[PDB]
């Protein structure tokens, strides 16, 4: 699944 962690 799509994962965004900046």
């Amino acid at each position, epitope marked *: 699944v*799509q*994962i*965004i*962690n*900046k």
Partner: antibody
Amino acid sequence: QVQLQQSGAALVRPGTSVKVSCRASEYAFTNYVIEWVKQRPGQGLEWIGVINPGSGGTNYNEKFKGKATLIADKSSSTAYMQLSSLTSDDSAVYFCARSTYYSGALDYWGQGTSVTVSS
Amino acid sequence: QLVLTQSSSASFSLGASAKLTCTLSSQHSTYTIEWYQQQPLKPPKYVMELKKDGSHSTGDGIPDRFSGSSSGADRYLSISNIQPEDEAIYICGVGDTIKEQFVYVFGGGTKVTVLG
């Protein structure tokens, strides 16, 4: 009104380096990230990378590792990109934009900074 | 591997209905995309976030005539009653974690011309 205010047009010589600035106002600087986008004259958008001002953590497009450095100063709510070893290929408009830690949306954009590498 | 393919640059009559397509790389069929609007000589503007189920959130100062929808890997920007101000290049973007780094990638853009 959320605003990102970028530094003015740059005309520089090849082999040199330039620092563009991106000053945030009217929003919590360290509750969001700053990303940087490149736009060559007739071309599309190229993602450069992201700096988390609250953490100082960065993520770069592979293509720009060794070309772009992202820095941010929490005390001044200002993000910076140094471009080094400049060539003709680095001639472009550079945008900063606000994004969140956990979503893709660049929801507010700077006005852009024209970098011209020329003799 | 993360790829956005855009609908061929298209022309629409003033007041007509426009639908643009942004197509995700098939393995990323479930992903949320963003749409951007870039008018001539201006910075890009955030239009909306668009999810796999076709649910969307529009950006500051985006009129109600912009909506979004989805079908498999396809992400659509719909413009009803298209206006002159709507002439622009529409660009899709998508974020993910690849090899433990964040990456954002843009589509090549679709130039939208408003006829009449």
